[PDB]
Tab-separated table of all heavy atoms in Angstrom:
chain	number	residue	atom	x	y	z
A	375	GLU	N	129.604	-106.373	-47.681
A	375	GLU	CA	130.893	-106.729	-48.263
A	375	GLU	C	131.942	-106.968	-47.186
A	375	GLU	O	132.865	-107.766	-47.386
A	375	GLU	CB	131.357	-105.636	-49.225
A	376	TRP	N	131.819	-106.290	-46.044
A	376	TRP	CA	132.734	-106.488	-44.927
A	376	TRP	C	132.383	-107.705	-44.082
A	376	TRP	O	133.147	-108.047	-43.173
A	376	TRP	CB	132.756	-105.239	-44.041
A	377	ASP	N	131.257	-108.362	-44.358
A	377	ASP	CA	130.829	-109.524	-43.591
A	377	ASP	C	131.652	-110.772	-43.888
A	377	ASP	O	131.460	-111.790	-43.213
A	377	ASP	CB	129.350	-109.814	-43.856
A	378	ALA	N	132.546	-110.724	-44.878
A	378	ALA	CA	133.346	-111.897	-45.215
A	378	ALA	C	134.220	-112.328	-44.043
A	378	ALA	O	134.333	-113.524	-43.751
A	378	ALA	CB	134.202	-111.611	-46.449
A	379	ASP	N	134.844	-111.371	-43.361
A	379	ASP	CA	135.666	-111.678	-42.198
A	379	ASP	C	134.780	-111.760	-40.961
A	379	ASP	O	134.134	-110.776	-40.586
A	379	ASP	CB	136.754	-110.622	-42.020
A	380	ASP	N	134.748	-112.935	-40.329
A	380	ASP	CA	133.843	-113.147	-39.205
A	380	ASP	C	134.331	-112.440	-37.946
A	380	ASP	O	133.534	-111.839	-37.219
A	380	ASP	CB	133.673	-114.644	-38.946
A	381	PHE	N	135.633	-112.499	-37.672
A	381	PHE	CA	136.180	-111.999	-36.410
A	381	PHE	C	136.245	-110.479	-36.463
A	381	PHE	O	137.256	-109.891	-36.843
A	381	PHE	CB	137.551	-112.608	-36.148
A	382	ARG	N	135.155	-109.826	-36.075
A	382	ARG	CA	135.057	-108.374	-36.123
A	382	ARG	C	135.130	-107.807	-34.712
A	382	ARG	O	134.404	-108.255	-33.819
A	382	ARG	CB	133.767	-107.937	-36.817
A	382	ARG	CG	133.701	-106.451	-37.124
A	382	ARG	CD	132.381	-106.085	-37.776
A	382	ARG	NE	132.268	-106.651	-39.114
A	382	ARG	CZ	131.150	-106.676	-39.826
A	382	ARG	NH1	130.019	-106.176	-39.356
A	382	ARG	NH2	131.166	-107.215	-41.042
A	383	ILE	N	136.013	-106.830	-34.518
A	383	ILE	CA	136.252	-106.197	-33.227
A	383	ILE	C	135.836	-104.736	-33.326
A	383	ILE	O	135.987	-104.108	-34.381
A	383	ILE	CB	137.732	-106.327	-32.801
A	383	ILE	CG1	137.924	-105.933	-31.335
A	383	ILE	CG2	138.643	-105.516	-33.713
A	383	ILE	CD1	137.513	-107.004	-30.356
A	384	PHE	N	135.290	-104.201	-32.231
A	384	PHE	CA	134.851	-102.813	-32.166
A	384	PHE	C	135.903	-102.010	-31.413
A	384	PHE	O	136.144	-102.247	-30.224
A	384	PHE	CB	133.486	-102.705	-31.490
A	385	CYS	N	136.535	-101.072	-32.113
A	385	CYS	CA	137.519	-100.178	-31.522
A	385	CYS	C	136.833	-98.891	-31.083
A	385	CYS	O	136.091	-98.278	-31.858
A	385	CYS	CB	138.634	-99.874	-32.522
A	385	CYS	SG	139.467	-101.337	-33.177
A	386	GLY	N	137.088	-98.484	-29.838
A	386	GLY	CA	136.453	-97.319	-29.269
A	386	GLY	C	137.474	-96.406	-28.614
A	386	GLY	O	138.635	-96.776	-28.404
A	387	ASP	N	137.005	-95.200	-28.283
A	387	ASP	CA	137.840	-94.122	-27.757
A	387	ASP	C	138.913	-93.728	-28.773
A	387	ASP	O	140.117	-93.819	-28.524
A	387	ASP	CB	138.458	-94.505	-26.406
A	388	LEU	N	138.446	-93.288	-29.937
A	388	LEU	CA	139.308	-92.851	-31.026
A	388	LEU	C	139.253	-91.336	-31.139
A	388	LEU	O	138.164	-90.751	-31.175
A	388	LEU	CB	138.891	-93.480	-32.359
A	388	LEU	CG	139.368	-94.891	-32.711
A	388	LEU	CD1	140.890	-94.949	-32.774
A	388	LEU	CD2	138.812	-95.931	-31.755
A	389	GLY	N	140.422	-90.703	-31.188
A	389	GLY	CA	140.462	-89.284	-31.487
A	389	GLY	C	139.991	-89.019	-32.906
A	389	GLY	O	140.149	-89.854	-33.800
A	390	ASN	N	139.390	-87.844	-33.108
A	390	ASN	CA	138.878	-87.494	-34.430
A	390	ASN	C	140.000	-87.472	-35.462
A	390	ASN	O	139.861	-88.025	-36.559
A	390	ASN	CB	138.167	-86.142	-34.375
A	391	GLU	N	141.124	-86.840	-35.123
A	391	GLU	CA	142.274	-86.837	-36.019
A	391	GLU	C	143.221	-87.997	-35.739
A	391	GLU	O	144.038	-88.344	-36.599
A	391	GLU	CB	143.024	-85.509	-35.908
A	392	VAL	N	143.130	-88.600	-34.551
A	392	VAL	CA	144.043	-89.681	-34.190
A	392	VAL	C	143.793	-90.911	-35.054
A	392	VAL	O	144.737	-91.556	-35.525
A	392	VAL	CB	143.915	-90.008	-32.691
A	393	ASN	N	142.527	-91.260	-35.271
A	393	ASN	CA	142.201	-92.435	-36.065
A	393	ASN	C	142.455	-92.164	-37.543
A	393	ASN	O	142.057	-91.122	-38.072
A	393	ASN	CB	140.743	-92.836	-35.841
A	394	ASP	N	143.115	-93.109	-38.209
A	394	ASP	CA	143.447	-92.964	-39.619
A	394	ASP	C	143.743	-94.341	-40.196
A	394	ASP	O	143.869	-95.329	-39.469
A	394	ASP	CB	144.637	-92.019	-39.819
A	395	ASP	N	143.845	-94.391	-41.526
A	395	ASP	CA	144.177	-95.644	-42.199
A	395	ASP	C	145.567	-96.128	-41.809
A	395	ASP	O	145.794	-97.333	-41.656
A	395	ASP	CB	144.073	-95.469	-43.714
A	396	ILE	N	146.515	-95.200	-41.655
A	396	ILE	CA	147.865	-95.575	-41.239
A	396	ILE	C	147.844	-96.160	-39.833
A	396	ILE	O	148.587	-97.099	-39.523
A	396	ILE	CB	148.811	-94.365	-41.338
A	397	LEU	N	147.001	-95.608	-38.956
A	397	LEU	CA	146.872	-96.161	-37.610
A	397	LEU	C	146.334	-97.585	-37.651
A	397	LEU	O	146.807	-98.458	-36.911
A	397	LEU	CB	145.969	-95.266	-36.761
A	398	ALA	N	145.343	-97.840	-38.508
A	398	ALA	CA	144.825	-99.196	-38.659
A	398	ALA	C	145.891	-100.135	-39.208
A	398	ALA	O	146.002	-101.286	-38.768
A	398	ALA	CB	143.594	-99.191	-39.563
A	399	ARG	N	146.680	-99.662	-40.176
A	399	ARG	CA	147.758	-100.482	-40.722
A	399	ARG	C	148.782	-100.827	-39.650
A	399	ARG	O	149.256	-101.968	-39.576
A	399	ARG	CB	148.426	-99.759	-41.892
A	400	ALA	N	149.139	-99.852	-38.813
A	400	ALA	CA	150.023	-100.131	-37.685
A	400	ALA	C	149.378	-101.100	-36.703
A	400	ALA	O	150.077	-101.887	-36.056
A	400	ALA	CB	150.404	-98.830	-36.979
A	401	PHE	N	148.051	-101.057	-36.580
A	401	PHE	CA	147.326	-102.007	-35.748
A	401	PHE	C	147.127	-103.356	-36.427
A	401	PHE	O	146.711	-104.310	-35.762
A	401	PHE	CB	145.966	-101.428	-35.354
A	402	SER	N	147.412	-103.461	-37.726
A	402	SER	CA	147.234	-104.709	-38.467
A	402	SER	C	148.459	-105.602	-38.257
A	402	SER	O	149.293	-105.807	-39.142
A	402	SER	CB	146.995	-104.424	-39.943
A	403	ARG	N	148.556	-106.142	-37.039
A	403	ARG	CA	149.673	-107.019	-36.709
A	403	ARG	C	149.541	-108.371	-37.401
A	403	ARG	O	150.519	-108.888	-37.954
A	403	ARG	CB	149.770	-107.198	-35.195
A	404	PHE	N	148.345	-108.958	-37.380
A	404	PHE	CA	148.139	-110.253	-38.007
A	404	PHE	C	148.111	-110.117	-39.530
A	404	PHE	O	147.661	-109.099	-40.062
A	404	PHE	CB	146.838	-110.881	-37.517
A	405	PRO	N	148.595	-111.132	-40.250
A	405	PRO	CA	148.668	-111.026	-41.717
A	405	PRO	C	147.317	-110.932	-42.405
A	405	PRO	O	147.262	-110.487	-43.558
A	405	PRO	CB	149.413	-112.304	-42.123
A	405	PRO	CG	149.161	-113.258	-41.004
A	405	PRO	CD	149.121	-112.419	-39.763
A	406	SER	N	146.233	-111.340	-41.750
A	406	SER	CA	144.925	-111.340	-42.390
A	406	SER	C	144.473	-109.919	-42.709
A	406	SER	O	144.876	-108.951	-42.060
A	406	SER	CB	143.894	-112.032	-41.498
A	406	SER	OG	142.577	-111.641	-41.845
A	407	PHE	N	143.632	-109.804	-43.736
A	407	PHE	CA	143.153	-108.502	-44.181
A	407	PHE	C	142.327	-107.832	-43.090
A	407	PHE	O	141.484	-108.470	-42.453
A	407	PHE	CB	142.324	-108.651	-45.455
A	408	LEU	N	142.573	-106.543	-42.877
A	408	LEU	CA	141.905	-105.768	-41.848
A	408	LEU	C	140.787	-104.927	-42.461
A	408	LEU	O	140.495	-105.009	-43.658
A	408	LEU	CB	142.923	-104.896	-41.111
A	409	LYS	N	140.149	-104.106	-41.628
A	409	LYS	CA	139.145	-103.147	-42.075
A	409	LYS	C	139.325	-101.865	-41.281
A	409	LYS	O	139.242	-101.878	-40.050
A	409	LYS	CB	137.726	-103.697	-41.903
A	409	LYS	CG	137.237	-104.539	-43.072
A	409	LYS	CD	137.320	-103.776	-44.385
A	409	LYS	CE	136.397	-102.566	-44.381
A	409	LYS	NZ	136.564	-101.732	-45.603
A	410	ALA	N	139.569	-100.762	-41.985
A	410	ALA	CA	139.821	-99.472	-41.360
A	410	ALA	C	138.577	-98.596	-41.284
A	410	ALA	O	138.694	-97.403	-40.983
A	410	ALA	CB	140.930	-98.731	-42.114
A	411	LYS	N	137.399	-99.153	-41.551
A	411	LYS	CA	136.181	-98.356	-41.555
A	411	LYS	C	135.837	-97.891	-40.145
A	411	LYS	O	135.843	-98.681	-39.197
A	411	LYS	CB	135.022	-99.158	-42.148
A	411	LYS	CG	134.893	-100.575	-41.612
A	411	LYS	CD	133.670	-101.269	-42.191
A	411	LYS	CE	133.319	-102.525	-41.410
A	411	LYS	NZ	134.350	-103.586	-41.569
A	412	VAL	N	135.549	-96.599	-40.011
A	412	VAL	CA	135.138	-96.002	-38.745
A	412	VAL	C	134.019	-95.013	-39.030
A	412	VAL	O	134.065	-94.278	-40.023
A	412	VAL	CB	136.315	-95.309	-38.029
A	413	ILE	N	133.007	-94.996	-38.159
A	413	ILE	CA	131.880	-94.093	-38.354
A	413	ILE	C	132.357	-92.654	-38.228
A	413	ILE	O	133.151	-92.316	-37.340
A	413	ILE	CB	130.751	-94.417	-37.361
A	413	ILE	CG1	131.212	-94.225	-35.915
A	413	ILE	CG2	130.259	-95.840	-37.566
A	413	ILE	CD1	130.087	-94.302	-34.906
A	414	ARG	N	131.892	-91.800	-39.137
A	414	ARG	CA	132.340	-90.417	-39.185
A	414	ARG	C	131.218	-89.543	-39.722
A	414	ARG	O	130.246	-90.032	-40.305
A	414	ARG	CB	133.599	-90.264	-40.050
A	415	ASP	N	131.363	-88.236	-39.509
A	415	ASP	CA	130.368	-87.285	-39.981
A	415	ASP	C	130.307	-87.287	-41.503
A	415	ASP	O	131.320	-87.464	-42.184
A	415	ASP	CB	130.691	-85.881	-39.468
A	416	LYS	N	129.097	-87.097	-42.036
A	416	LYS	CA	128.910	-87.127	-43.483
A	416	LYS	C	129.641	-85.978	-44.167
A	416	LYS	O	130.259	-86.169	-45.221
A	416	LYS	CB	127.419	-87.089	-43.818
A	417	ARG	N	129.585	-84.779	-43.587
A	417	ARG	CA	130.175	-83.603	-44.220
A	417	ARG	C	131.601	-83.348	-43.739
A	417	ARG	O	132.543	-83.353	-44.537
A	417	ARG	CB	129.294	-82.376	-43.962
A	418	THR	N	131.773	-83.127	-42.435
A	418	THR	CA	133.083	-82.777	-41.900
A	418	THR	C	134.018	-83.973	-41.783
A	418	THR	O	135.237	-83.783	-41.713
A	418	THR	CB	132.936	-82.113	-40.528
A	418	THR	OG1	132.168	-82.959	-39.664
A	418	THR	CG2	132.239	-80.766	-40.662
A	419	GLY	N	133.485	-85.191	-41.760
A	419	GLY	CA	134.314	-86.369	-41.619
A	419	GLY	C	134.846	-86.615	-40.226
A	419	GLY	O	135.690	-87.502	-40.052
């Protein structure tokens, strides 16, 4: 479902608590729809 947007960038060196949806929104400078998905632990997140 996320494959619709071709221009996909890999963000690295993210703090466990530093990374958040609000951080992605602040990073969403361009008007196009973004994706805030980040790999996380299944239980602890």
Side-chain angles (χ1 to χ4, degrees), residues 378 382-383 385-386 388-389 398 400 405-406 409-411 413 418-419:
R382 190 182 292 169
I383 192 79
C385 304
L388 277 299
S406 159
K409 274 304 296 174
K411 47 177 195 292
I413 62 170
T418 54

